[PDB]
Protein backbone atom coordinates (compact mmCIF):
# COMPACT_ATOMS: atom_id res chain seq x y z
CA UNK A 1 0.00 0.00 0.00
CA UNK A 2 1.82 3.09 -1.12
CA UNK A 3 2.00 5.88 1.40
CA UNK A 4 -0.27 9.19 0.75
CA UNK A 5 1.72 12.07 1.04
CA UNK A 6 1.35 16.02 -0.02
CA UNK A 7 3.63 18.37 -1.43
CA UNK A 8 5.94 20.14 1.06
CA UNK A 9 5.69 23.47 -1.12
CA UNK A 10 5.06 26.48 1.30
CA UNK A 11 1.89 28.35 0.95
CA UNK A 12 4.09 31.10 -1.26
CA UNK A 13 5.27 27.92 -3.49
CA UNK A 14 1.15 27.60 -4.19
CA UNK A 15 -1.03 28.32 -7.26
CA UNK A 16 -4.79 28.55 -7.36
CA UNK A 17 -7.03 26.04 -8.66
CA UNK A 18 -9.66 27.90 -10.17
CA UNK A 19 -8.18 30.32 -11.76
CA UNK A 20 -4.31 31.49 -12.56
CA UNK A 21 -3.24 33.20 -9.75
CA UNK A 22 -0.73 32.66 -6.92
CA UNK A 23 -2.06 31.77 -3.05
CA UNK A 24 -2.40 34.76 -1.31
CA UNK A 25 -3.64 33.65 2.32
CA UNK A 26 -5.57 30.77 4.04
CA UNK A 27 -8.95 31.75 4.63
CA UNK A 28 -12.41 31.11 6.85
CA UNK A 29 -16.17 32.11 7.03
CA UNK A 30 -18.27 30.15 8.67
CA UNK A 31 -21.11 32.47 8.29
CA UNK A 32 -21.37 31.68 4.55
CA UNK A 33 -25.03 30.70 3.36
CA UNK A 34 -24.25 29.54 0.22
CA UNK A 35 -23.66 26.26 -0.51
CA UNK A 36 -19.69 25.12 -1.83
CA UNK A 37 -19.73 23.50 -4.89
CA UNK A 38 -16.96 24.44 -6.96
CA UNK A 39 -15.98 22.00 -10.00
CA UNK A 40 -12.27 23.14 -10.69
CA UNK A 41 -9.65 21.99 -8.09
CA UNK A 42 -11.44 19.30 -6.74
CA UNK A 43 -9.72 15.94 -6.87
CA UNK A 44 -9.82 13.19 -4.35
CA UNK A 45 -7.00 12.26 -1.92
CA UNK A 46 -6.23 9.04 -4.12
CA UNK A 47 -6.24 11.14 -7.47
CA UNK A 48 -9.25 11.10 -8.95
CA UNK A 49 -10.19 14.03 -10.72
CA UNK A 50 -13.82 15.43 -10.18
CA UNK A 51 -16.09 18.30 -11.83
CA UNK A 52 -13.82 20.65 -14.85
CA UNK A 53 -10.66 19.63 -13.26
CA UNK A 54 -7.63 19.66 -15.12
CA UNK A 55 -3.90 19.55 -14.58
CA UNK A 56 -2.83 22.51 -16.56
CA UNK A 57 -2.09 25.81 -14.56
CA UNK A 58 -2.32 27.19 -18.33
CA UNK A 59 -6.02 25.40 -18.65
CA UNK A 60 -7.95 26.74 -15.70
CA UNK A 61 -10.62 28.69 -17.12
CA UNK A 62 -9.62 28.79 -20.43
CA UNK A 63 -11.34 28.21 -23.78
CA UNK A 64 -10.29 26.99 -26.70
CA UNK A 65 -12.08 26.27 -30.44
CA UNK A 66 -13.27 28.98 -33.46
CA UNK A 67 -15.05 31.92 -33.68
CA UNK A 68 -18.09 31.23 -35.65
CA UNK A 69 -19.45 34.99 -36.25
CA UNK A 70 -19.88 38.57 -34.90
CA UNK A 71 -23.67 38.52 -33.19
CA UNK A 72 -21.03 46.72 -27.92
CA UNK A 73 -19.74 43.81 -30.10
CA UNK A 74 -20.37 40.18 -29.07
CA UNK A 75 -18.70 36.81 -30.92
CA UNK A 76 -19.91 33.42 -31.00
CA UNK A 77 -17.49 30.97 -30.01
CA UNK A 78 -17.45 26.98 -30.55
CA UNK A 79 -15.39 25.81 -28.01
CA UNK A 80 -13.30 22.16 -28.17
CA UNK A 81 -11.66 20.28 -25.59
CA UNK A 82 -8.07 22.02 -24.23
CA UNK A 83 -6.07 19.45 -26.34
CA UNK A 84 -7.67 20.83 -29.55
CA UNK A 85 -9.93 17.78 -29.95
CA UNK A 86 -13.88 18.37 -29.99
CA UNK A 87 -15.77 18.30 -27.01
CA UNK A 88 -18.45 15.20 -26.77
CA UNK A 89 -21.57 16.59 -24.73
CA UNK A 90 -22.27 12.97 -24.19
CA UNK A 91 -19.01 12.46 -22.16
CA UNK A 92 -19.72 12.41 -18.22
CA UNK A 93 -18.42 15.99 -17.09
CA UNK A 94 -20.41 19.12 -16.52
CA UNK A 95 -18.50 21.10 -19.28
CA UNK A 96 -15.12 21.08 -21.53
CA UNK A 97 -12.53 20.34 -18.52
CA UNK A 98 -10.93 24.23 -17.37
CA UNK A 99 -14.22 25.59 -17.74
CA UNK A 100 -14.88 28.67 -15.13
CA UNK A 101 -16.99 27.35 -12.23
CA UNK A 102 -18.61 30.81 -11.00
CA UNK A 103 -20.76 33.43 -11.93
CA UNK A 104 -19.22 36.72 -13.16
CA UNK A 105 -17.96 38.66 -16.31
CA UNK A 106 -14.37 37.11 -16.79
CA UNK A 107 -11.82 39.51 -17.97
CA UNK A 108 -9.11 37.86 -20.37
CA UNK A 109 -7.17 38.06 -24.16
CA UNK A 110 -8.65 36.66 -26.96
CA UNK A 111 -5.99 35.42 -29.45
CA UNK A 112 -5.78 33.86 -32.71
CA UNK A 113 -3.38 31.77 -35.21
CA UNK A 114 -4.58 31.56 -38.68
CA UNK A 115 -5.21 27.65 -40.20
CA UNK A 116 3.13 32.11 -42.61
CA UNK A 117 -0.15 32.44 -40.22
CA UNK A 118 -1.69 36.22 -39.40
CA UNK A 119 -2.18 36.93 -35.83
CA UNK A 120 -4.58 39.34 -33.36
CA UNK A 121 -5.48 39.59 -30.61
CA UNK A 122 -7.80 41.52 -28.56
CA UNK A 123 -8.95 41.95 -24.77
CA UNK A 124 -12.16 40.16 -24.24
CA UNK A 125 -15.22 39.87 -21.59
CA UNK A 126 -17.26 36.36 -20.97
CA UNK A 127 -20.05 36.42 -18.86
CA UNK A 128 -20.37 32.80 -17.64
CA UNK A 129 -23.65 33.95 -16.42
CA UNK A 130 -25.31 34.38 -19.48
CA UNK A 131 -28.06 32.45 -21.62
CA UNK A 132 -25.24 32.28 -24.22
CA UNK A 133 -23.06 30.72 -22.04
CA UNK A 134 -23.30 27.05 -23.07
CA UNK A 135 -20.17 25.35 -23.06
CA UNK A 136 -21.73 21.71 -22.54
CA UNK A 137 -23.48 22.67 -26.01
CA UNK A 138 -19.70 23.31 -27.40
CA UNK A 139 -20.62 27.07 -27.67
CA UNK A 140 -19.95 30.01 -25.84
CA UNK A 141 -20.00 34.35 -26.55
CA UNK A 142 -17.50 36.85 -25.68
CA UNK A 143 -17.49 40.46 -26.25
CA UNK A 144 -15.04 42.56 -27.21
CA UNK A 145 -13.75 46.58 -27.21
CA UNK A 146 -12.66 45.76 -30.45
CA UNK A 147 -15.07 45.84 -32.98
CA UNK A 148 -14.34 44.45 -36.50
CA UNK A 149 -10.52 42.79 -35.82
CA UNK A 150 -11.96 38.95 -34.97
CA UNK A 151 -11.39 36.27 -38.02
CA UNK A 152 -14.12 33.89 -38.08
CA UNK A 153 -13.31 29.95 -38.55
CA UNK A 154 -9.75 30.44 -37.34
CA UNK A 155 -8.12 29.02 -34.07
CA UNK A 156 -8.95 30.68 -31.29
CA UNK A 157 -7.29 30.91 -27.64
CA UNK A 158 -8.75 32.57 -24.32
CA UNK A 159 -5.90 33.53 -22.39
CA UNK A 160 -7.43 34.22 -18.67
CA UNK A 161 -6.29 37.18 -16.73
CA UNK A 162 -9.18 38.77 -14.06
CA UNK A 163 -12.97 39.93 -14.00
CA UNK A 164 -14.45 42.94 -15.81
CA UNK A 165 -16.25 44.38 -12.95
CA UNK A 166 -17.36 43.26 -9.60
CA UNK A 167 -20.27 46.02 -9.60
CA UNK A 168 -23.77 44.88 -9.31
CA UNK A 169 -24.77 44.34 -12.92
CA UNK A 170 -21.89 42.24 -13.48
CA UNK A 171 -23.22 39.31 -11.10
CA UNK A 172 -19.74 38.22 -9.10
CA UNK A 173 -20.51 35.32 -6.90
CA UNK A 174 -17.67 32.85 -6.50
CA UNK A 175 -19.95 30.18 -4.83
CA UNK A 176 -22.86 30.23 -7.89
CA UNK A 177 -22.07 28.01 -11.07
CA UNK A 178 -22.72 28.71 -14.26
CA UNK A 179 -25.35 27.04 -16.15
CA UNK A 180 -23.49 25.11 -18.41
CA UNK A 181 -26.14 23.98 -20.94
CA UNK A 182 -27.67 27.61 -20.45
CA UNK A 183 -31.61 28.33 -19.57
CA UNK A 184 -33.73 25.63 -18.42
CA UNK A 185 -31.55 22.73 -18.15
CA UNK A 186 -29.86 21.51 -14.71
CA UNK A 187 -26.34 21.05 -14.49
CA UNK A 188 -24.86 17.51 -15.00
CA UNK A 189 -22.00 14.93 -13.61
CA UNK A 190 -21.17 17.72 -11.14
CA UNK A 191 -18.14 17.03 -8.17
CA UNK A 192 -20.10 17.06 -4.97
CA UNK A 193 -20.76 19.61 -2.43
CA UNK A 194 -18.25 20.15 0.89
CA UNK A 195 -19.02 21.00 4.20
CA UNK A 196 -18.39 20.66 7.72
CA UNK A 197 -19.87 17.37 9.35
CA UNK A 198 -18.98 18.52 12.56
CA UNK A 199 -20.14 21.29 14.79
CA UNK A 200 -17.36 23.87 15.80
CA UNK A 201 -15.90 23.13 12.20
CA UNK A 202 -16.04 25.43 9.18
CA UNK A 203 -14.17 25.07 5.88
CA UNK A 204 -10.44 25.88 4.96
CA UNK A 205 -9.65 28.09 1.92
CA UNK A 206 -6.69 28.64 -0.04
CA UNK A 207 -7.43 32.34 -1.09
CA UNK A 208 -5.98 34.59 -3.91
CA UNK A 209 -6.93 37.74 -5.09
CA UNK A 210 -8.07 38.58 -8.75
CA UNK A 211 -7.21 41.56 -10.49
CA UNK A 212 -9.65 44.25 -12.27
CA UNK A 213 -10.18 45.37 -15.19
CA UNK A 214 -12.09 48.63 -14.15
CA UNK A 215 -13.87 49.96 -11.10
CA UNK A 216 -13.86 49.49 -7.26
CA UNK A 217 -13.27 45.53 -5.44
CA UNK A 218 -10.72 43.86 -4.01
CA UNK A 219 -12.25 40.80 -4.79
CA UNK A 220 -11.09 37.06 -4.16
CA UNK A 221 -11.29 33.66 -5.53
CA UNK A 222 -10.73 30.61 -2.69
CA UNK A 223 -10.17 26.91 -3.98
CA UNK A 224 -10.91 24.15 -1.81
CA UNK A 225 -6.77 22.87 -3.28
CA UNK A 226 -4.20 24.24 -4.61
CA UNK A 227 -3.34 23.32 -8.39
CA UNK A 228 0.12 21.73 -7.35
CA UNK A 229 -2.12 19.29 -4.35
CA UNK A 230 -4.22 18.35 -7.36
CA UNK A 231 -1.44 17.27 -9.58
CA UNK A 232 0.35 15.65 -6.81
CA UNK A 233 -2.64 13.56 -5.50
CA UNK A 234 -3.31 12.40 -9.22
CA UNK A 235 0.06 11.22 -9.80
CA UNK A 236 0.25 9.24 -6.57
CA UNK A 237 -3.11 7.70 -6.80
CA UNK A 238 -2.25 6.78 -2.91
CA UNK A 239 -5.11 4.85 -1.72
CA UNK A 240 -7.15 6.28 1.08
CA UNK A 241 -6.71 4.81 4.14
CA UNK A 242 -9.61 6.16 5.66
CA UNK A 243 -12.23 9.14 5.49
CA UNK A 244 -10.00 12.02 7.18
CA UNK A 245 -6.04 12.76 7.07
CA UNK A 246 -4.74 14.53 10.23
CA UNK A 247 -2.38 17.87 8.73
CA UNK A 248 -0.34 19.97 10.34
CA UNK A 249 0.46 23.50 8.86
CA UNK A 250 3.95 23.12 9.99
CA UNK A 251 7.04 25.92 10.55
CA UNK A 252 9.71 24.41 9.11
CA UNK A 253 12.21 26.92 10.38
CA UNK A 254 10.97 26.49 14.12
CA UNK A 255 9.25 23.25 13.75
CA UNK A 256 6.15 24.37 15.33
CA UNK A 257 2.92 23.22 14.40
CA UNK A 258 0.88 26.72 13.73
CA UNK A 259 -2.48 24.47 14.08
CA UNK A 260 -4.16 21.00 13.15
CA UNK A 261 -6.36 20.29 10.50
CA UNK A 262 -8.66 17.83 8.59
CA UNK A 263 -7.98 16.83 5.32
CA UNK A 264 -11.17 14.90 3.55
CA UNK A 265 -11.05 12.35 1.00
CA UNK A 266 -13.16 14.16 -1.35
CA UNK A 267 -10.74 16.54 -0.98
CA UNK A 268 -10.93 19.64 1.35
CA UNK A 269 -9.95 20.87 4.60
CA UNK A 270 -12.09 21.91 7.87
CA UNK A 271 -10.67 23.44 10.90
CA UNK A 272 -11.95 23.82 13.92
CA UNK A 273 -12.57 27.65 14.23
CA UNK A 274 -14.72 30.74 15.19
CA UNK A 275 -13.49 33.50 13.57
CA UNK A 276 -14.21 34.66 9.73
CA UNK A 277 -11.13 36.32 7.81
CA UNK A 278 -7.77 35.63 6.75
CA UNK A 279 -5.86 32.86 8.77
CA UNK A 280 -2.54 34.58 11.14
CA UNK A 281 -0.05 32.23 9.45
CA UNK A 282 3.68 32.53 8.14
CA UNK A 283 4.04 32.66 4.19
CA UNK A 284 6.56 29.88 4.54
CA UNK A 285 4.38 27.41 6.45
CA UNK A 286 2.88 23.92 4.76
CA UNK A 287 0.85 21.33 5.26
CA UNK A 288 2.25 18.13 6.78
CA UNK A 289 0.24 14.86 6.55
CA UNK A 290 0.63 13.09 10.06
CA UNK A 291 -1.86 10.13 10.16
CA UNK A 292 -4.91 8.68 9.10
CA UNK A 293 -7.86 9.67 11.55
CA UNK A 294 -11.44 9.36 11.86
CA UNK A 295 -14.32 11.15 13.72
CA UNK A 296 -13.46 10.11 17.11
CA UNK A 297 -9.99 12.70 16.65
CA UNK A 298 -11.18 15.74 17.61
CA UNK A 299 -9.28 19.17 16.21
CA UNK A 300 -7.83 21.56 18.57
CA UNK A 301 -8.86 24.67 18.38
CA UNK A 302 -7.50 26.97 16.07
CA UNK B 1 -2.53 -4.97 20.23
CA UNK B 2 -3.40 -2.46 22.23
CA UNK B 3 -4.56 -2.88 26.44
CA UNK B 4 -6.55 -0.83 28.34
CA UNK B 5 -6.64 -0.99 32.15
CA UNK B 6 -9.86 0.76 33.68
CA UNK B 7 -10.12 1.69 37.20
CA UNK B 8 -12.05 4.05 39.72
CA UNK B 9 -15.06 2.47 39.83
CA UNK B 10 -18.19 2.09 42.53
CA UNK B 11 -20.46 3.85 44.40
CA UNK B 12 -20.95 7.84 45.31
CA UNK B 13 -23.05 9.83 47.02
CA UNK B 14 -25.29 12.25 44.88
CA UNK B 15 -23.87 15.03 44.39
CA UNK B 16 -20.28 14.11 44.73
CA UNK B 17 -17.46 13.28 42.55
CA UNK B 18 -15.74 10.13 40.88
CA UNK B 19 -12.34 10.15 39.02
CA UNK B 20 -11.68 6.97 36.02
CA UNK B 21 -8.51 6.42 34.94
CA UNK B 22 -7.40 4.36 31.78
CA UNK B 23 -3.77 3.37 31.15
CA UNK B 24 -3.06 2.25 27.58
CA UNK B 25 0.06 -0.32 26.92
CA UNK B 26 1.41 -2.25 24.22
CA UNK B 27 1.20 -1.01 20.41
CA UNK B 28 0.12 2.26 20.72
CA UNK B 29 1.05 5.23 18.09
CA UNK B 30 2.40 8.84 19.22
CA UNK B 31 -1.21 9.86 17.25
CA UNK B 32 -4.26 8.86 19.00
CA UNK B 33 -7.64 9.96 20.94
CA UNK B 34 -8.77 7.99 24.41
CA UNK B 35 -12.63 8.36 25.36
CA UNK B 36 -15.55 7.26 27.64
CA UNK B 37 -18.40 5.44 26.80
CA UNK B 38 -21.17 5.01 29.16
CA UNK B 39 -24.62 2.75 28.70
CA UNK B 40 -27.21 3.53 31.78
CA UNK B 41 -29.11 0.43 32.72
CA UNK B 42 -31.92 0.12 29.87
CA UNK B 43 -30.45 2.21 27.56
CA UNK B 44 -27.68 2.35 24.89
CA UNK B 45 -24.35 3.24 24.67
CA UNK B 46 -23.36 6.92 24.70
CA UNK B 47 -19.69 9.03 24.26
CA UNK B 48 -19.50 10.79 27.70
CA UNK B 49 -16.16 12.55 26.90
CA UNK B 50 -12.79 12.11 24.71
CA UNK B 51 -9.02 14.02 24.11
CA UNK B 52 -7.17 13.56 21.34
CA UNK B 53 -3.33 13.65 21.15
CA UNK B 54 -3.10 17.33 19.63
CA UNK B 55 -5.42 18.43 22.58
CA UNK B 56 -9.02 18.55 21.22
CA UNK B 57 -11.76 17.48 23.68
CA UNK B 58 -15.28 16.51 22.87
CA UNK B 59 -18.08 16.37 25.30
CA UNK B 60 -21.43 15.16 25.62
CA UNK B 61 -23.75 17.51 25.93
CA UNK B 62 -25.79 16.26 29.37
CA UNK B 63 -22.14 16.10 31.02
CA UNK B 64 -20.46 19.57 29.96
CA UNK B 65 -19.54 21.83 32.54
CA UNK B 66 -19.56 18.77 34.97
CA UNK B 67 -17.12 16.73 33.86
CA UNK B 68 -13.35 16.87 32.50
CA UNK B 69 -11.17 14.94 30.51
CA UNK B 70 -7.12 14.63 30.82
CA UNK B 71 -4.13 13.05 30.38
CA UNK B 72 -0.41 12.43 31.13
CA UNK B 73 1.01 11.66 27.87
CA UNK B 74 4.23 10.33 30.17
CA UNK B 75 2.38 7.88 31.65
CA UNK B 76 0.14 7.65 28.28
CA UNK B 77 -3.12 7.24 31.05
CA UNK B 78 -6.35 9.18 30.10
CA UNK B 79 -8.39 10.53 33.42
CA UNK B 80 -12.11 11.40 33.93
CA UNK B 81 -12.98 13.85 36.98
CA UNK B 82 -17.03 13.53 37.03
CA UNK B 83 -17.82 16.32 39.70
CA UNK B 84 -21.65 17.08 40.58
CA UNK B 85 -22.65 13.28 39.83
CA UNK B 86 -26.74 12.48 39.89
CA UNK B 87 -28.87 9.35 39.84
CA UNK B 88 -29.02 9.90 36.05
CA UNK B 89 -25.38 9.38 35.78
CA UNK B 90 -25.73 6.29 37.23
CA UNK B 91 -24.09 3.49 34.39
CA UNK B 92 -21.18 1.04 32.88
CA UNK B 93 -18.29 3.38 32.24
CA UNK B 94 -16.46 2.48 29.41
CA UNK B 95 -12.71 3.15 27.69
CA UNK B 96 -12.22 3.62 24.21
CA UNK B 97 -9.05 3.83 22.66
CA UNK B 98 -8.14 4.75 18.83
CA UNK B 99 -4.56 4.36 17.62
CA UNK B 100 -3.41 6.12 14.26
CA UNK B 101 -0.86 5.89 11.62
CA UNK B 102 0.35 6.98 8.35
CA UNK B 103 0.41 4.14 7.12
CA UNK B 104 -2.29 1.89 8.01
CA UNK B 105 -6.32 2.16 8.80
CA UNK B 106 -7.15 3.42 12.41
CA UNK B 107 -6.93 0.68 15.10
CA UNK B 108 -9.17 0.40 17.67
CA UNK B 109 -9.39 -0.80 21.72
CA UNK B 110 -11.74 -1.30 24.18
CA UNK B 111 -12.21 -2.06 27.61
CA UNK B 112 -14.05 -4.22 29.71
CA UNK B 113 -16.00 -1.41 32.08
CA UNK B 114 -16.73 -0.14 35.62
CA UNK B 115 -19.75 0.42 37.43
CA UNK B 116 -20.94 3.69 38.81
CA UNK B 117 -23.31 4.30 40.68
CA UNK B 118 -24.94 7.40 41.73
CA UNK B 119 -27.69 6.80 44.68
CA UNK B 120 -29.44 7.85 48.29
Known amino acids: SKPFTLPILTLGELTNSRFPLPIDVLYTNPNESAIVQCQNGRCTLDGELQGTTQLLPTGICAFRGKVTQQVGTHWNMTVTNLNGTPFDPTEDVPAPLGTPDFSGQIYGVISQRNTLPANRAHEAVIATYSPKFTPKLGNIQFSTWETQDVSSGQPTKFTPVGLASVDANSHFDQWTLPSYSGALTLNMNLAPSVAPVFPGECLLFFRSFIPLKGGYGNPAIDCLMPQEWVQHLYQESAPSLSDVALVRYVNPETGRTLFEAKLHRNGFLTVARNSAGPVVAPTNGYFRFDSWVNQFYTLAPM | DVQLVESGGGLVQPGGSLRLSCAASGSIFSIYAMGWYRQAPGKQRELVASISSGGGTNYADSVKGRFTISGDNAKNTVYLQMNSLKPEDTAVYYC??????????????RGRGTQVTVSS
Open chain 2, 96 to 109: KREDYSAYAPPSGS
